[PDB]
Design a protein around this ligand. Structure first.
Ligand SMILES: N=C1N[C@H]2[C@H](CS[C@H]2CCCCC(=O)NCCCCCC(=O)O)N1
Ligand SMILES: N=C1N[C@H]2[C@H](CS[C@H]2CCCCC(=O)NCCCCCC(=O)O)N1
Ligand SMILES: N=C1N[C@H]2[C@H](CS[C@H]2CCCCC(=O)NCCCCCC(=O)O)N1
Ligand SMILES: N=C1N[C@H]2[C@H](CS[C@H]2CCCCC(=O)NCCCCCC(=O)O)N1
Lengths: 123, 123, 123, 123
C-alpha cells in the first residue's frame, strides 16, 4: 500500500511541487519544482523507501536527492530529504533535509543548510 | 568528464563501510552500500544525484544519495541520506553530513532521526 | 527592549514542554526547562544567548540555549541545544532546530546525536 | 575529572579560540573568538555539561551557545554546539552545531547552517 500511497503529486508549506513514483521494491523517481532559491522548472529526483514497512503503526522510512542542475540553471548544490511517509486520510511525508553547496575547503563550514518540510498530497 | 571520473569508484570511511558508486548519465548516482555497523548486513541499493557541471573556481562538486536499509535478507525500517561534496586533488575525498530516519509512531517521531558526518576516501 | 520583552516568559511546544526563560543583561538567557518526553523528570537548568540588538527589517531575533539532562532527580547523560529565532507579531513564536547528544563510546558516536525541530508559542 | 578536563583553552580545525570554565554542577562559561565569518574579537558563550557522566568509557555530554554580537560587531545570528568531551591522552570535544541567522519567514528555509567541529586543548 505504501507504493500507491507514496506515488503522486505532493506540495509542502513552501508551495513546491514534488511528483514521485514509488516502485514495488524500493525505488523513488520523479521531479521537483521549487518555490524558493536559485531554481526554475523541474529537476530530476531519485531516492529509496522501505517497501516492507513495519505493521505496528510506524511510518515508512524514505529519502531522496535533487541536484540543482537542469537544462537552464545550475545552483551547484544538492538537497537530500530524509523522513517517513504516514498514510491514511491525511497522509503526510514528514522530512528533514540537508542542502550542500559546492564550496572551497575554506568555506566548507558554510556549505550545508538544514531544515524540515512536511508534504501533503495534492493528486 | 572529471566529475564522473572522480566520483565513480569504490570508497571507504573510518567505520570501514564499502560504498561502490557510478556517476554518469548527466547527474545520476547508482551503486551499492555495505555498512560495517548498525542493523545491516551485506549490500543495499543506493541512488542519488550529483552536479554534472560543477564550478571550476576551486569549489567541490555537490552530491547526495539515499540508502533504504532493506535488502533481500534484512530490513531495519530506516533510510539514510548523505548530502555533501566531492573534492578532488591529491587527497580526494567525499565530505558528507547525513540524516538517518527510522520509521516510528507519531509519539516517537521526536526520536526518529540521527545526524552525523562521514568522510569517504577512495580505495 | 522589545527583544527582551518578546522572549521573556513561559512557552510551550508541540510536545507539551514548559520552557521558562528570561532574556536580559544584553544577551543572556536563563531559566528552566521541563520535558514532556524522554528520560526526564521535573525542571532542568537552561542557559543561552540571544541577539540583543536584532535587525529591524522584518527578520527574527536569533537565539540558542542548552539543557544538560541532569538535575537532582535524574541524569540521562545527554544535552540538547536549540538554535533558532524569535519572531514577533500576532502569533509570536520561537522557531528552533535542535541537536540532542548522548554520551557514547567513540565506536557508538554515529548513534549519539538526534536532530529535530520545535516551535514554541507563549503561554 | 570532567570539570578539570573541560576547563581550559581549546582550538579546532578552523583555528578558533574557545576559552571555557566548567563549574562543579554543570555550568559552562567563557569566550569564543572565530577564525571565519562575520566576526571579530571575543564573544560571550554559556552552556551546560553533565557533571556526573557515566564511567563505562562514554563521553561527557555538553553544549553551549554564542550569539554573534559583541561591542563592535553584530552578525544577527547564534550558534549552538552539541557534543561530548572525551578525556585521556588524546582529549577532544567532538561537536555538531547549528548556526541560525535572523531571517524573514519567507527566508527561514535558509536560516540555519549545520556542521561539525573537533576541539583539542591548547592549554
Ligand atoms: N523545500 C525546500 N526548499 C529549500 C529547502 C531545502 S532545498 C531548498 C531549495 C533550493 C533550491 C536551489 C538553491 O537555491 N541552491 C543554492 C542554495 C544556496 C544557499 C546559500 C546560503 O544562503 O547559505 N527546502
Ligand atoms: N557510515 C555510517 N554508518 C551509520 C551512519 C549513518 S548510516 C548508519 C548505518 C545504519 C545501518 C542501518 C541501521 O542500523 N538502521 C537503524 C538505526 C536505528 C538507530 C536508532 C537510534 O539509535 O536512535 N554513518
Ligand atoms: N522538545 C524536545 N524534547 C525532546 C526533543 C530534543 S530534547 C528531547 C527530550 C530529551 C529528554 C532527555 C533524554 O531522554 N535524553 C536521552 C535521549 C536518548 C535518545 C536515545 C535514542 O533514541 O537515540 N525535543
Ligand atoms: N567553528 C565554526 N565556525 C563557524 C561554524 C559555526 S559558527 C561559524 C562562525 C560564525 C561567525 C558569525 C557569522 O558569520 N554569522 C553569520 C552567518 C551567516 C551565514 C549565511 C549563509 O552563508 O548561509 N563553526
Amino acid at each position: 500500500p505504501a507504493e500507491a500511497g507514496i506515488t503522486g503529486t505532493w506540495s509542502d508549506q513552501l508551495g513546491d511541487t514534488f511528483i514521485v513514483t514509488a516502485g514495488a521494491d524500493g525505488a523513488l523517481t520523479g521531479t521537483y519544482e521549487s518555490a524558493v532559491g536559485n531554481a526554475e522548472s523541474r529537476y530530476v529526483l531519485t531516492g529509496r523507501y522501505d517497501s516492507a514497512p513495519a505493521t505496528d503503526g510506524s511510518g515508512t522510512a524514505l529519502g531522496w536527492t535533487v541536484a540543482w542542475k537542469n537544462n537552464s540553471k545550475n545552483a551547484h548544490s544538492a538537497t537530500t530529504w530524509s523522513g517517513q511517509y504516514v498514510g491514511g486520510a491525511d497522509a503526510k511525508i514528514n522530512t528533514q533535509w540537508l542542502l550542500t553547496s559546492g564550496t572551497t575547503n575554506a568555506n566548507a563550514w558554510k556549505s550545508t543548510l538544514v531544515g524540515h518540510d512536511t508534504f501533503t498530497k495534492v493528486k
